[model samples]
Target chain A: KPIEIIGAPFSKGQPRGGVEKGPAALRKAGLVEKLKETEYNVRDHGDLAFVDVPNDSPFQIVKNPRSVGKANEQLAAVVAETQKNGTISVVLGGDHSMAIGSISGHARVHPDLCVIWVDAHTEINTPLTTSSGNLHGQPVAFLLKELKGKFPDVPGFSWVTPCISAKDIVYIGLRDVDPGEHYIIKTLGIKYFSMTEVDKLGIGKVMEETFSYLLGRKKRPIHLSFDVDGLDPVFTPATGTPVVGGLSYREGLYITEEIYKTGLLSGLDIMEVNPTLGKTPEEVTRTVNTAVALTLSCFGTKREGNHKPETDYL
Target chain B: KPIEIIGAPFSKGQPRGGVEKGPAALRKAGLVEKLKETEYNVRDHGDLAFVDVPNDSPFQIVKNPRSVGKANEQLAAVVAETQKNGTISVVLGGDHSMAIGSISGHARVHPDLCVIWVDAHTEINTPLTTSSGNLHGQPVAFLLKELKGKFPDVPGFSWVTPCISAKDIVYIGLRDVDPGEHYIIKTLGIKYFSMTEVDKLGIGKVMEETFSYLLGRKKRPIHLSFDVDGLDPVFTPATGTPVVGGLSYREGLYITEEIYKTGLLSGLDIMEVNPTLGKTPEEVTRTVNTAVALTLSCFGTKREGNHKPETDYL
Candidate 1:
């Protein structure tokens, strides 16, 4: 199958310095080479450009409430055009915020879609509810139609319907959840699998449960919004918001491998990779390794490598 | 031989963010457990912290020059203490800038030391010569007592005597050499190896020449300053300054492995790993694997356990 690599190098939504460089960084790190090595015909569609909205602007007052709507406009055009050309779109992210655009674009064709947000946080904060004022924290809330009250006159998104119900989406690796995100999850009653669940039930079992939870409802289109931050900062340090105690390298890839096994994984978004920041040569290596590992996992990569995981660097 | 793990988190010499987080990030990445699994007696000496130098100042001057000095002073003391306690110290870095202190400490007893600077850039920019004003860029210059003009005189480092003369040092991967750095190398008549050399003679031959060159001289203590950014950004994304067409993962590890064959390798400073910045999970895993691989190569880690080379994530 031909995999079209889409770049969304956006830094406008967050105050971070490196998200805009995410797409290039991922590409430069050899994502194309990896996929091609895996025997897929890779077509790189360079990053989608967007009108820059400076931070501390009036937009924050309304929340990312409409940014996703505006971005979804561009996403819809690019994704539809590419899908029409019969290419499987694999959008590399500037941030997790792009998921709203990615899912919107995918859902434009298949309105009856389901999203499984495998991340460390729920990402359900609305404008009034979010504390950091970073839009990345709230894309999911807007995508699910929870923040519609804050978004008025959203252009090119008039037909934007909440593609999936809270019951349809399954959240995993949720440990460092914000209060707003926590409240939304409880109030909306979305089913989530936390680290506790993973520890008690195991990742294979959790993914098994998550798959059944989503597919049990209707076999709708699936969009996996995979954030590298969900993997522990031990391996991923260049993320905008890195939370410790997330998934291990193998466990995180197991989720992607399971996604591929389901064969229901339709659209995919790999988000939040910033190559500019790392702790050591090894740490940067870990970040790049983790990013590629997830992609490999998504495509059903088998673990048979010449890796000396036990070797200590002294 | 017992291997000691030293948490040397010193980053005052650089002008980037997150590199200061190296030692802790590596620790959190389970380096201790991973090393123990390698059958090495691992001692986790908790990280040595440096004074926080604020980056908000528009003042072009290199801020925290003294802080860098103090951090190194503490570093030299710790490495000396670690050595006195009877174990080979493997120094993990916050930045290459720590070499001034790491080498100073290593040289305290063994004054006749041979220096091997392996990196893309020579990192010899003195304060007056450096445009970015990152101390990390000028570590070797500072270590070799070559700083005179713009480099400020900092306290605590006064006791550090130059360990290696300019001619005794070997430079590798000198493609993106700064004007001042190039002038310094030529003026000092330092025997260096560049990418052209690697291309012409391959890493094996290049390393073979480097080993013979070092061995030709008196039996001096050897110090290896290894910056991960020396590898191509294609293999390592977590570096701050990524120049294209660097060392491949296998080649980078091979360099380390060959260094192990030298038997005279003494001190090691693995610096500038930005774990948060990778293209994908596999990229991060690959980078991590490379770091782990380089470590294995250096410490004689053979592919003993049903190991196979992996490109699943490339």
Candidate 2:
């Protein structure tokens, strides 16, 4: 089966532009090549077209509440069509905004599906609660059906049910949650594993519990929405949002490797890769490499030992 | 005398425009407070604002080319004024390009001085060799008088005397180097301790050798050009350019703490701390915190143990 790659390159989720350049940068970093090298039947569907750049702030739409909603609509259609042929869906992203569509589409076939979001942020913003006005920051809130008072109205509400329930969503490697986002995640009863938890409990234990917790009851399809920002800025600096305290390169890979072992992943999103934010060509190049490497990890590529992957800088 | 902080936030050396925000972001991140908290009398001499954005590519100037020259001219004047007032000049950055002026101003007094460049990059691009076309890339070449062939027409060459030979410079934490940079270092007999060297020889031995080697000949003033990018992006993400696998936070601080202990530090250029690049408030806050912390380290602050510094994402 082809590894169906759908790139959601857009800046409509955040006030800052350039996330639209993320997919292209990742592609340039040799994502398709790595997949092919690993022998996956790789099909590259370039970036999904955005409706338009709006005059107002995108976060006003909740990371762009309406735009995020619209983008997700397009994403859902693609995922559903791709899945109809039993192709493994691998979606690349500009930000967390695409989650609403990608997660919803994957869950259509498995009503009991659960989501695991590994990131530095919880992406729990809504129009009323968020001050930054980035729609990318609000995807989790909308996806969990927990945006009634905060945003008042989130677009595409009718098109999607609560595809992912609060209890079914797990946030790992969270180190940089906004004050408002913190409130929403706690309020919604979402299960979160912060860096402190990982440090204290170990990544393996935390991930084992998360995987078991998600797949315990239903034996349903699991969707992994892995935000590259979840990794430390040292490894992934060109993210839409870079948090200093992220998982180490080894720790980050372990998460994907563990996920692959479960054989339950039906969809994966490699999100929040924003190359325009890179401080140097070297940093940009490294970020692109990290994005592709993470995908490779998700696909179960093995290494000889604890070999440190070198960035293509020198 | 109050510490003279010349806001030399100029980044015309590269294509990125927001590095003009470096000094301001550091201030907002609480630079003055960090100094005051450490009991240093701080003074704010506002930034040297460019009258107009230069229209030339930074690379064309080759060795200290166009923007590099104009940037240094402004920096030299400010550094001279600050030093004349018997104040310790702490120059903030727009890019590494400002080092040409800062070093020149310091050299006016300490003719036999040594320069310690603590950074991930050598910033050694001569006008003729670099492909990035960012002026920030050409500083080291200009300072070392190594751009004779690559850029004979480089600007401000007349103002710069080969103040000190390449032997007077000590480079630490260098990871990314172009072939031209490596060749020049080898041919000119300059001493550089790269990250690989640090990993093998240990930072203590490397720094011990660096300080002793530079000071062995003459107990001259040492001007430290500490680009925050020298620290891992986990510590400083908003630098004009960031390269990963840099010195750990402790190692970085140890360098500064050690330098302060020597008391031979005559000046410092805290370059490339741009706040605008961070996508989240936490990220912006983290970059700001790292910049201030590095300054504190240079000013003689110390940590008790392996205390994890409170991150800005807090």
Candidate 3:
């Protein structure tokens, strides 16, 4: 079956203004054609229509509470329907916060959705511990019902029971986790590979170890959540929260390819491709094109027979 | 073996539309990769995509028709073959009308193609040359052979047969010449070098003197065209024809070095060099870098002056 392409184009979850434009920019960069080149069946569901919430007030420390919740709520419905139809869901991000909807919706049907959070930051802050007040920083907390009481009442998110567990989730490329996030990860015994580990183990061994730790015995359906910030600023300077010393381009591509080999990749989230962040049109094209290339790697673009060496040197 | 990188992200065969974005923009300014760093036999295949063709129209006198038809058509073929061979092609260029095809399917297949015409005005006027014109002035006329007959009623050029004879093809940075390119170079008795004879035989003894006379002694290969506006305008500032005391970067780079060292180096048209023409700081840098590098490469700087004349490939 083909992957269901769902675009979540609402960026209010964070303070950044341009990430909402990520989906459109990606499409313009020929996202569909790129995927098609890999011979994958792709059905683009277009972008979700996001409406700004009235009196968009925050509850507790979470900013833009209603709008973030509302957008995720909308996203969850579509993600759930896409999964229930028995096809992989490829979710293009409005921002990282949309994961609340993506994972929750996947959980509603699978209930055993395993998440591979590929990001530089843990993005696990809740309303109580968030210093930035951005809900994008809190999606993971809401997705895990174990932390339910830790968050204040968010009207629209009340329906979102935690669908992911600390044990079922594995984090890669985590170099910028908040203090509370680090505490939660350590206390809950979550599996994660910080950049330091990635550096030590190398990407190949890191993925091997990650897969062994998370899928030692049984094969579980996987949701691959990718944040562009997880990539080094050199490759993805257009992201909202760029972290230095993140995964290199080849390393990032390797992660997706390895995950695809397991046949457990159920869904994907290519988040934080903010086109407006680039300084030039060419710069913007570079980021958007890189995003597309990474996405294609997940599908099945082998480096051999695909990438050619320079034969016609000037 | 790794394919050499080739970037050809030029605009239509005209001026002002950011053709230089081909190389630096393609390289994203990063020339090497990890694959190359590890010595996995890789060569960068630089950019081949181009920007928009502004107001794409055909000028009357120059017959500047077919918005990049000839250039793109040749490029498409060049790019396709290089990819097909399993080797990459690094092509860097945006202009130099004749370079539409030197600058090989836009690098290596046309090995026999010989070129020798350095000038302030390359005397390659089309049949429809008018008092006012553009099309990089006459790059098309110089490269395409089949255009000499009565103008064919065609929509645009499909397959351009390379014009210009081998023996009749010798020129060195002329200053001024009007009225039928001085009888198409003396009705094809072509052997010329004007510019007050490089201030009376100073530009490295006018191509080894005997090198020009010895052309009659057996068949030599290609001439390898190189024109940095023949060097002037502070080295090029005014007119589509920038002629202000040419041959400043030295002539030996052209004669005693390049042609003498490599016998098979064919036609090249190093045409445009004018910072007065475009916007952006990089544009000047782009033009300067491209022109300067190609000029150096022609000067025999590509070789290391090594001792080995042995086959080392395993």
Candidate 4:
């Protein structure tokens, strides 16, 4: 299978600017060449134009709503176009907020798309419910048409209809969800597993249950949106919001591997790899390398079980 | 086996000051506790007192030669004492110059000790041949009594004598060797491998040749002096001087594991992990984490053959 590489290098969803550099850093880290060596054919469509949507309404609960909306609209279009061409799309993120565009793009092509949202914080707050003005935390609310009238009007997002149902998305690695997000998850009966659940069930079991619950006997096209912050700060410290006690390097990669094994993986977003937040080049390398490794795993670069079985093992 | 951890926190061997913080940064990265979880009994012997050796005379070819000599003298004493206690001494270094003390201390007890010098820059220049005038670059020269008389009298180094011959040390990961170092390596016919050789032969072969050439059949005590800079800048970019296309993380760990497998390991030095050089906390974490992982590998942390052998094949 060939995967289309889309670089969404806009970070207006959050105040931080370094994430816009995520695509460049991943390329510098040799992502393209690394992927080319795998079984899949890699197509790099290059990056979307870097743009800033004016923050015309400062009084709104969601900060930079216009910019985030405008950026995602462009992103959603790119994602939709890539999917229309019949290739798996790998979107290198500017932030988790880019999911609004990526997931929407996937959903537009396959209306029954299932989203596997991996992140420490659930960016599910609607513009009305968000306490912090940052729009990065409010992308999920804009995607569900069921909550349409609830979300405030951000000029650029008017074209976006609700593309996913609340039941269509599953959350993994949620450790820092806001009160509003917690209430919404419960209210909507969203499928989510916190670190506490990860600790109880183990990552393998968590993923197994995630698949059984979402896809059941019939697998649907899956759009995996991975936030680097979903990993423990120990593994990825350059993210915008770091939470303690998260996924290990192996666990993160395992998630990607399992998803790819499903054969239903339609797209992936390796988001929030902020090179600038890393205090040193070594730190940036760590995060970027992890990002690249996880992405490669999704494309079928197996880290384990590559050798022929030893049938005579005692 | 329980390893005695010794922190050589003094960095007077060079002008760089942040390496003095290496021990603290490594500890903060949870090196001690992480190693404790392994099979080895980890003993922390606290850091040696940080000191400055006054440069009473400035005419010496090596800049701060007095300070470097004085610090190494103290470090050597501490290392010697730790070795005498019958536990493998694991030294966290302030600078590669700390090797003067570490290698000297190991040699004092095991007269037939062989050193595995893993660094990007050979760090083997004699005082007379060094252009940077940093004693960190000249530790190998001073340690080899053959070149003792060639070095000008640095005030504090008069008491120190060469402990190892050129034939006793093997250099790995030498990509940025100075002209003087290159001349010395070839002239002395010392066993050395550059990144070019590493490229030709894999790291596994490099280690096999190293052990065969140096220790042969006799398994003598091995003092591995690992400079973070030996790794490619992608893996250890926070190092004082990083050379590209150096050892990978797997290769670095492989070197340590092979040395430990010999069961003749006497001392280990995780050197040149400069936390301050890293621009962000993430960068420092990467270097420190690497140093910790390498040290653990040396002290019997198994990285291979953990998975059960396969029992079935299609």
Best by lDDT: 4
Cα miss at A175, model 4 (Å)? 25
lDDT per residue (tens digit) for residues A112-189 in model 3: 768899999888887788898887787888887578787577766777887777888889999998889999989888
Candidate 4: misplaced stretches above 4 Å?
A: A1-314, B305-314
lDDT of 2 by residue, A164-235 (tens): 668788888886766566666655667888765565456778898897777777677778898888887889
User: lDDT by residue for model 1 over A1-314, one digit each (tens)?
Assistant: 76788888776567776776777767777888877766457788877877643442345454443454566668767886776676677888887777877877777776676787878888887767777766777778767754566544433346555666677678888988987678888987899999899888767678778878888867766788888888889768888788889886657766776677677667888888877666676766678777876886677553311112333211
CA shift of B200, model 1, Å = 48
Q: Give the alpha carbon lDDT tens digit for every residue of A1-314 in model 4.
A: 77899998978778888999999999999999988887778899999995775545754666676777778888889989989888999999888888888888888898988889899887877777777877788778888766778655776678788988887888888767665667677667888887656654568889999999889966799989899999988789998898755788999999999987898999899999999999887889999999999998887778864432565655
Positional deviation of A214 in candidate 2, in angstroms? 1.9
Q: Write the per-residue lDDT of candidate 2 for residues B1-314, one digit (tens) a residue.
A: 35778888776666677877888888876787768755467888888876543564443434325556766877787787777676778988877788889988877766777889988988787667777666677677777755455556565456765566788888899998888888878888889989999888766667788977988766877788988888888777776677989987656766776787788777898888777777677777877777777788777564321112232111
lDDT of 3 at B136: 54
Once fitted onto the true fold, the runs of candidate 1 whose alpha carbons sit more than 4 angstroms away are A53-56, A60-69, A145-160, A304-314, B1-314
Off by over 4 Å in 2: A53-65, A146-150, A155-158, A305-314, B1-314
What TM-score goes with each of the models?
Answer: 0.48, 0.52, 0.52, 0.53
RMSD to truth, every model:
18.4, 14.0, 17.3, 14.3
DockQ by candidate, in order: 0.02, 0.02, 0.02, 0.01
Better of 2 and 4 by DockQ: 2
- The candidates, ranked best first by TM-score, are 4, 3, 2, 1
Q: Write the per-residue lDDT of candidate 3 for residues B1-314, one digit (tens) a residue.
A: 44355556554555555545535543443443422442225555545554344565554544344555555555647654764574434345555553545433432453333456666565455535434445555553545443445243222454554544434355676655544444454444556665544443545666766355535464444535455565554433422455544555545254535564554343333444444453566655554654545533443444444322475856
TM-score top scorer: 4
